[PDB]
Design a protein around this ligand. Structure first.
Ligand SMILES: CC(C)CN(C[C@@H](O)[C@H](Cc1ccccc1)NC(=O)O[C@H]1CCO[C@H]2OCC[C@H]21)S(=O)(=O)c1ccc(B(O)O)cc1
Ligand SMILES: [Cl-]
Ligand SMILES: [Cl-]
Ligand SMILES: [Cl-]
Ligand SMILES: [Cl-]
Ligand SMILES: [Cl-]
Ligand code: NA
Lengths: 99, 99
């Protein structure tokens, strides 16, 4: 698909057996999802942006489906105001910015 | 160009005659730049990011070049961690996300 940027580029994802809405975010290095449980090991991390830092749980080797495209990678879970698909997963679905 | 996302999508911008680095950010509604001098009046705005809200100064109808493409629009100035080009100006340069 070609997604214009007149509005937020929101898509449906499937993660941990749940459907969620998430933002395709070229400005995010990593993928950050609101509180949920995921299987396997995790380690704490701090991530920062406008307004400062939040503490998240880092889960590695998590399978997501992003607008129908499967990809595996690290997912950060914590008190993000929006679910964000960051570059670590955007690369895996072949997403590019074009102009 | 077609910009892949293995690296941050950093570009050069020109604003007020000065070159700066900025991040092409599809997750940002608005364009936010670090402290600098801009002409004219400003209006208040609160924006919310990952770690909470920050106050910024809103300057309208500012001339800005993004990766060589001319835009004229709203620039927010404040304590952002990096300069971010948001959708208000990504749309002016004709940017889309593609996969
Ligand atoms: C500021 C940016 C450099 C980074 N962010 C990504 C932005 O796209 C961010 C996403 C977002 C959207 C909505 C609420 C919270 C976070 N966008 C953002 O902060 O947008 C602000 C500023 C611009 O205009 C508004 O548009 C949306 C909310 C406002 S970030 O969300 O702060 C972020 C994501 C991942 C990581 B990491 O993996 O170490 C670190 C930081
Ligand atoms: Cl929107
Ligand atoms: Cl990853
Ligand atoms: Cl590629
Ligand atoms: Cl450039
Ligand atoms: Cl604008
Ligand atoms: Na894991």
């Amino acid at each position: 698909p070609q997604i214009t940027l007149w509005k937020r580029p929101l898509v449906t994802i499937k993660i941990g057996g749940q459907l969620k809405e998430a933002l395709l975010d070229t400005g995010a290095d990593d993928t950050v999802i609101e509180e949920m449980s995921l299987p396997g090991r995790w380690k704490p991390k701090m991530i920062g942006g406008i307004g400062g830092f939040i503490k998240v749980r880092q889960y590695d080797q998590i399978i997501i489906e992003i607008a129908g495209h499967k990809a595996i990678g690290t997912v950060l879970v914590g008190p993000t105001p929006v679910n964000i698909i960051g570059r670590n997963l955007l690369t895996q679905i072949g997403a590019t910015l074009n102009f």
